[PDB]
Amino acid sequence: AIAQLATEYVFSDFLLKEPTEPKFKGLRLELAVDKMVTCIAVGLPLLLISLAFAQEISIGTQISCFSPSSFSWRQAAFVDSYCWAAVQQKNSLQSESGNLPLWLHKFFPYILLLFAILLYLPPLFWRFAAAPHICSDLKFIMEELDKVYNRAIKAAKSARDFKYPIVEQYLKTKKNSNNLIIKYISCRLLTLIIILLACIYLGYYFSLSSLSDEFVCSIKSGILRNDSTVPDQFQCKLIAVGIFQLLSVINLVVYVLLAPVVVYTLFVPFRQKTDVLKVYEILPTFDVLHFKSEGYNDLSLYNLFLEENISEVKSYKCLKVLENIKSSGQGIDPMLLLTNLGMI
Amino acid sequence: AIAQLATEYVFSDFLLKEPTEPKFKGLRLELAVDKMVTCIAVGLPLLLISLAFAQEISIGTQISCFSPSSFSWRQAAFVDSYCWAAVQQKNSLQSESGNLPLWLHKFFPYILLLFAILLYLPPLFWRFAAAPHICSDLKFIMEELDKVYNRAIKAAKSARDFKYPIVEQYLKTKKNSNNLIIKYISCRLLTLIIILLACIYLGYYFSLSSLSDEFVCSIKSGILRNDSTVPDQFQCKLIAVGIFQLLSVINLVVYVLLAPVVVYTLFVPFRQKTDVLKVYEILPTFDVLHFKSEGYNDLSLYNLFLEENISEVKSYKCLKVLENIKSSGQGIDPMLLLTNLGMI
Amino acid sequence: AIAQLATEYVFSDFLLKEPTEPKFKGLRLELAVDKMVTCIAVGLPLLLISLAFAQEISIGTQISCFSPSSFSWRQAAFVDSYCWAAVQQKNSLQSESGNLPLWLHKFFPYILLLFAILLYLPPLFWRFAAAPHICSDLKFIMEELDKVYNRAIKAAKSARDFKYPIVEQYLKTKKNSNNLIIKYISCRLLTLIIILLACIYLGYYFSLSSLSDEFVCSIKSGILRNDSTVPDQFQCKLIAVGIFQLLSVINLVVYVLLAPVVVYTLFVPFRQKTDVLKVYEILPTFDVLHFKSEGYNDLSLYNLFLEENISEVKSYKCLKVLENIKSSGQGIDPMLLLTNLGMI
Amino acid sequence: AIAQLATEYVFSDFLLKEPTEPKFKGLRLELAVDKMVTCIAVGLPLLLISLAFAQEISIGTQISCFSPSSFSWRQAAFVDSYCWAAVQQKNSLQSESGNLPLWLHKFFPYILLLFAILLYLPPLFWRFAAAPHICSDLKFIMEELDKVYNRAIKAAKSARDFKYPIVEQYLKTKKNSNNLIIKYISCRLLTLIIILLACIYLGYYFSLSSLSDEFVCSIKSGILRNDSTVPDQFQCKLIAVGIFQLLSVINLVVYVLLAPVVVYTLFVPFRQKTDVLKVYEILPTFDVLHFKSEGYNDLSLYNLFLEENISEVKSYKCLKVLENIKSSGQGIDPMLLLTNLGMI
Numbered sequence A, B, C, D: 001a002i003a004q005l006a007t008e009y010v011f012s013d014f015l016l017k018e019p020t021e022p023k024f025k026g027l028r029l030e031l032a033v034d035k036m037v038t039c040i041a042v043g044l045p046l047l048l049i050s051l052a053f054a055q056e057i058s059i060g061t062q063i064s065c066f067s068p069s070s071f072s073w074r075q076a077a078f079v080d081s082y083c084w085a086a087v088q089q090k091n092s093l094q095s096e097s098g099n100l101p102l103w104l105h106k107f108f109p110y111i112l113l114l115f116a117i118l119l120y121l122p123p124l125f126w127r128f129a130a131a132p133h134i135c136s137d138l139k140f141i142m143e144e145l146d147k148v149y150n151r152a153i154k155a156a157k158s159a160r161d162f163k164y165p166i167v168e169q170y171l172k173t174k175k176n177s178n179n180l181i182i183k184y185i186s187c188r189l190l191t192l193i194i195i196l197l198a199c200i201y202l203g204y205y206f207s208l209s210s211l212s213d214e215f216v217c218s219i220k221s222g223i224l225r226n227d228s229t230v231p232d233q234f235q236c237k238l239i240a241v242g243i244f245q246l247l248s249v250i251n252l253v254v255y256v257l258l259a260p261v262v263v264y265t266l267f268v269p270f271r272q273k274t275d276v277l278k279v280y281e282i283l284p285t286f287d288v289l290h291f292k293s294e295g296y297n298d299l300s301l302y303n304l305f306l307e308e309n310i311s312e313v314k315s316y317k318c319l320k321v322l323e324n325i326k327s328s329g330q331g332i333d334p335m336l337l338l339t340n341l342g343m344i
């Protein structure tokens, strides 16, 4: 039913499932905006496919040819099925709009499924190629941040009663390499191109005259070519073509609204803001150097992933509340850190 | 069946599922009133869609055109399907009420699903954008309250046998920022606007003459335009239009009753009452300062979320019972706190 | 529905399920490229089979013979079923394209299923014959790497405050044996041959005239051979043949794009690059000798499997970050290793 | 659907499920070749049964008798059902090929299911009679091997810083008894005989003229015997007989390819090679005596089961890597064993 389709595709965790494995425990591995874009671009065409053939919106068979009254039920069924299979056969049918509109009307669900698959492909390539590496690197970075926070609080407590910046060096090294950012931009660009092509196709499909679904059909090949009792042609109409056009314009609207989001996603350096690591600069055990901005490198992408999935880090949360309290400046950062006692 | 739909949509945890993740363990992340509003506004139109096409209420096909007796079954089926697809084609049909009523009668389930999706969108935006931040902040606040309660009871026990207000400073800082409250008000306002538009549409749909479902249909395009055996027109009726109007007025009543709730929700400062933190003011380790009221800021929203999901805090429950006992004044707050022995 | 099939076969973990057993905990046991190739080559033909007979794309029965009007419904049904069963019987039918096109049109789903099974066979043979051995060997290798890393860090810590290369000897011994690599190459080659044969078949099927689906059928055997009221022949058409050809060309395109991937897979020594063990050469407890390249031996395959599933090793990750930091050369490898404190 | 059947029967763990009980944790209890043979011989005929009546390959009803035009739909249905039930009644029908072909055409699914059940019977008898005993014995043997390995490594460590061969005596005793091997050979031989009988039946079924499915049917018993309006006979055809023959030849090919595998399985002593226990002979605590070869006794079968499910033993894996390293001979077996430190 329509409501069942809605529950499956919008109100359920459709493509929102976290990786089912212990390797990525709590790691999104995909930005929220990218996940939203993929979920829409994939589950919208599927939802429209399901809707267009819902038991309520669908009168019945997808084509009716209006055989003569003399024709029996199965003769008329032969006519309808023959014309359905003959939309491909150009000789059989003669339609003013041509044969491409008939092809599109017959295979619209296939085309929507193709667009959905093509849009799901780049996210899958990301999740299967560049996701494990970033997951491992980000897990190491979070562990290092937790360890340095613990060491700093232990030092502060000892004072009240190595020291090498490994994480900073690793981030600096990531500043050079750009394979991950190149893959990310390539997959986003392919998604954008697929969306644009889908918009072109949907606009063309919705621009039809709405009468191209009606085509003339001739079961006059073979032994029936010279038969007399059979009329030279029939009036066939492809039902649900109006529904297809409505859903196609809906998908076109959604995709044109979505494309600016993908373009904004492509410009990762601009998105790289609100320095996540700036909060850690007040730790004595952490060097006061952010050095993450203004670069078409994997460093900006790692900064984005950190700003996305750093809320799960207790040390980061503690430092964030310390920073927020520092806005008033009533107290002292080391005193607040010592009082917090948030090792684990 | 009707009962199955009821069990799925009203008697089950439809959209009442808690976040399936360890990050939010026991945190609602959504006020009870907001959750009720979203659940109604989403699962009502879906329930009505399912009901309108239930196997019992539905006689059968959604349109019947009453072809002549001479017409065969599949000729009549062609007529019915053609008219169903031609509700869009204005030239084919001539109805007194126009063609918009026919469009609405055909696509009412789609319109209800659209309203449900549009009403579910703002809650989803909230849960995916502003929910993680408030979850982390509120978890930190609850942990701080538990820790300060434990410290105060330990101090009392030591007396019988830092001290910095970090949580108060954090709340004071939240008094300034307003991004969360702005997002909350924006999503509530969008929900209200969607509800009002849905009410307008449902009132228009229910105000129809009830005879607009009957339209005249002409299969007279193409080779059949000059055919003689076919009548110039047919009498088609869109079945289930009365059911659609009944369910639409039901949804209109529900939404007009719900809109005052959304308006009341918009005025969060008025809702900010029954100070949750007032109970903690009797703790020696906690400063006697509430400072949370009369502000279009995130502080009021945090106060609401606390008053919502603070019952899970054992320290808060203990302080609440101490406060309630203090109404009589027979005993002493520190003595009762020491006797409680409710560290964990 | 079409969307359900898509969810099952592309958006779900179809053939992507990890081995359901404690023996292989986190071990892929199959390279990512090989898994992708198998998943495509298997779940594409199945998806096309499901699509070709979807409730929306399918008009109805797969063959209609257009019995005379005098014929009753069940007489026409007998004609259609007889011709469906007589596509095999060459005498009954006379078609210009022959009888092989009719066989193919009738049994296309069977042929796609056969290709899917034949393509799934070599992966299954691998997973049931050569997977347990490589799993055990690789688990031992990872355990040895973890143990040597722990020993080296313990030695470094002791200095700050046996020694036999068992793993290197085992890898060197693997350099000689080649049964695993021979099995891998044989299964890949069989997969490639099956893909090529499938491409040949699909090209032949798509090269048909598109009118071979229309064949002449004669129910004139037995008592009906000399019957007069029955016409000497009927015009039968195999519906969905156009859909079969469309999906067959789609599968042909996918398989021709996939075959280069399989050919590249066959050349494992070229794939053996980015020495995984090179990072471990900086450990005092590990001998400085890689000795893994330029060989049609199981050593290259083991190197590939290591480069695939070594990210799960904490010691390997730590050594990798040490290597990446060494690019700048600011610090010292032993000092960084001591500071890391990543025993477990 | 066809793809669903494929997923259930070839791509899923059909009859590949490990024993669902804690008694056999990780013990196959069935050789890989035997499991493959059983899985094929059982799930192939079931798959063919499902395929032959798939919603796509099946035109409709399994028999059509071509009643006269004067006959009504339910008169024709009576004719078809009567002939379907009268394939057994020899007097009613007169077919050139006889009545056995009609029996076979009607009950082919039953015959395939019978063959599948008969082939599944011997494996079930094994798993319910001789599997628990071998499971217990093999678990004891693995535990003894682990214990002796632990004792030997402990002795080596003590030197660096009872002694009775219980397992060897148990294996020697198993050398005498042969009940398990006799049961194994009997079940394999019964499986082979069932496969041969199935091949005979399938060859006979596929050797039919392909026109035996067409039989003459006479509804002329009872009050209708002397009725005039009813024709003396009808032309009935059993649909799907061609599909049955195709699938039967497929099953015949599979079974003839499989029978050599079963014959090779029967010769267990030849399969008994690559002495698993030879690796343990280098342990000081283990006597240097294999004494397992060249015997129609349970010892060879136990050797096969060990070679199958010994990879799960850490001590065996360690000894195997020690053996492989000994190929070069660079080091010493006791030194390598001491350095390994693989007690558990």
Ligand SMILES: CC(C)CCC[C@@H](C)[C@H]1CC[C@H]2[C@@H]3CC=C4C[C@@H](O)CC[C@]4(C)[C@H]3CC[C@]12C
Residues within 6 Å of the ligand: A197, A198, A200, A201, A204
């Ligand atoms: C997804 C991508 C590939 C879709 C590409 C656009 C498709 C949907 C449409 C939009 C405009 C279309 C073209 C418009 C006009 C003509 C001229 C005609 O004489 C032949 C077909 C041809 C050349 C059409 C082919 C298909 C076409 C290119």
Ligand SMILES: CC(C)CCC[C@@H](C)[C@H]1CC[C@H]2[C@@H]3CC=C4C[C@@H](O)CC[C@]4(C)[C@H]3CC[C@]12C
Residues within 6 Å of the ligand: A196, A199, A200, A203, A204, A207, A256
């Ligand atoms: C992503 C955005 C830009 C998509 C907007 C849809 C655009 C591309 C659509 C809307 C209307 C469409 C046009 C409608 C009609 C025709 C006439 C036909 O003979 C050739 C294609 C052509 C000229 C179409 C080309 C594509 C088109 C311009």
Ligand SMILES: CC(C)CCC[C@@H](C)[C@H]1CC[C@H]2[C@@H]3CC=C4C[C@@H](O)CC[C@]4(C)[C@H]3CC[C@]12C
Residues within 6 Å of the ligand: B197, B198, B200, B201, B204
């Ligand atoms: C969800 C929102 C967009 C719904 C908006 C209201 C819809 C349901 C209805 C209510 C009143 C309607 C209008 C009433 C009268 C007319 C005048 C007529 O000559 C053209 C249509 C037009 C202009 C209608 C368009 C659709 C309309 C605006």
Ligand SMILES: CC(C)CCC[C@@H](C)[C@H]1CC[C@H]2[C@@H]3CC=C4C[C@@H](O)CC[C@]4(C)[C@H]3CC[C@]12C
Residues within 6 Å of the ligand: B196, B199, B200, B203, B204, B207, B256
């Ligand atoms: C949220 C609350 C206010 C909704 C209450 C429903 C109201 C808005 C409904 C109920 C009856 C409706 C009217 C019924 C009939 C017509 C005549 C038509 O030619 C134009 C629209 C118009 C004038 C409708 C406008 C909307 C309407 C006034």
Ligand SMILES: CC(C)CCC[C@@H](C)[C@H]1CC[C@H]2[C@@H]3CC=C4C[C@@H](O)CC[C@]4(C)[C@H]3CC[C@]12C
Residues within 6 Å of the ligand: C197, C198, C200, C201, C204
């Ligand atoms: C999967 C593998 C086995 C498929 C092999 C190719 C199949 C699909 C096709 C492609 C070309 C075909 C051949 C083309 C021409 C002829 C000549 C004709 O007089 C008899 C059939 C015969 C000999 C065909 C047999 C089937 C054939 C070989």
Ligand SMILES: CC(C)CCC[C@@H](C)[C@H]1CC[C@H]2[C@@H]3CC=C4C[C@@H](O)CC[C@]4(C)[C@H]3CC[C@]12C
Residues within 6 Å of the ligand: C196, C199, C200, C203, C204, C207, C256
């Ligand atoms: C893997 C790649 C190479 C596959 C590409 C498809 C090729 C092999 C296909 C496409 C068109 C096909 C041809 C189409 C028509 C005929 C005529 C027929 O009488 C014999 C087979 C023959 C000659 C086919 C042989 C195979 C063919 C050449």
Ligand SMILES: CC(C)CCC[C@@H](C)[C@H]1CC[C@H]2[C@@H]3CC=C4C[C@@H](O)CC[C@]4(C)[C@H]3CC[C@]12C
Residues within 6 Å of the ligand: D197, D198, D200, D201, D204
């Ligand atoms: C599974 C086992 C039992 C199958 C045994 C073979 C079956 C399928 C077939 C193969 C050959 C067949 C026989 C061939 C010829 C005749 C002679 C005829 O006048 C009576 C039936 C009889 C005697 C057939 C009986 C059934 C038969 C034995």
Ligand SMILES: CC(C)CCC[C@@H](C)[C@H]1CC[C@H]2[C@@H]3CC=C4C[C@@H](O)CC[C@]4(C)[C@H]3CC[C@]12C
Residues within 6 Å of the ligand: D196, D199, D200, D203, D204, D207, D256
């Ligand atoms: C396991 C292997 C050997 C099976 C190979 C199938 C063999 C046994 C099949 C293939 C063709 C079959 C023959 C086909 C036709 C007839 C004629 C009939 O009047 C008696 C049975 C008889 C003589 C069949 C006996 C069995 C048969 C020889």
Ligand SMILES: *[C@@H]1O[C@H](CO)[C@@H](O)[C@H](O)[C@H]1NC(C)=O
Residues within 6 Å of the ligand: A222, A223, A224, A225, A226
């Ligand atoms: C049909 O009859 C015409 C008469 O002109 C003839 O040309 C044609 O070949 C016939 N077709 C068939 C299929 O017999």
Ligand SMILES: *[C@@H]1O[C@H](CO)[C@@H](O)[C@H](O)[C@H]1NC(C)=O
Residues within 6 Å of the ligand: B222, B223, B224, B225, B226
């Ligand atoms: C139908 O016949 C009329 C007669 O006036 C003619 O004008 C019209 O073009 C014909 N239509 C078709 C589709 O042939």
Ligand SMILES: *[C@@H]1O[C@H](CO)[C@@H](O)[C@H](O)[C@H]1NC(C)=O
Residues within 6 Å of the ligand: C222, C223, C224, C225, C226
């Ligand atoms: C049909 O009648 C013809 C007349 O020539 C005869 O040859 C043939 O044998 C008959 N067929 C049957 C099945 O009785």
Ligand SMILES: *[C@@H]1O[C@H](CO)[C@@H](O)[C@H](O)[C@H]1NC(C)=O
Residues within 6 Å of the ligand: D222, D223, D224, D225, D226
């Ligand atoms: C049918 O009529 C015949 C006439 O010869 C007679 O012999 C036979 O008994 C009748 N059968 C029945 C069932 O009445």
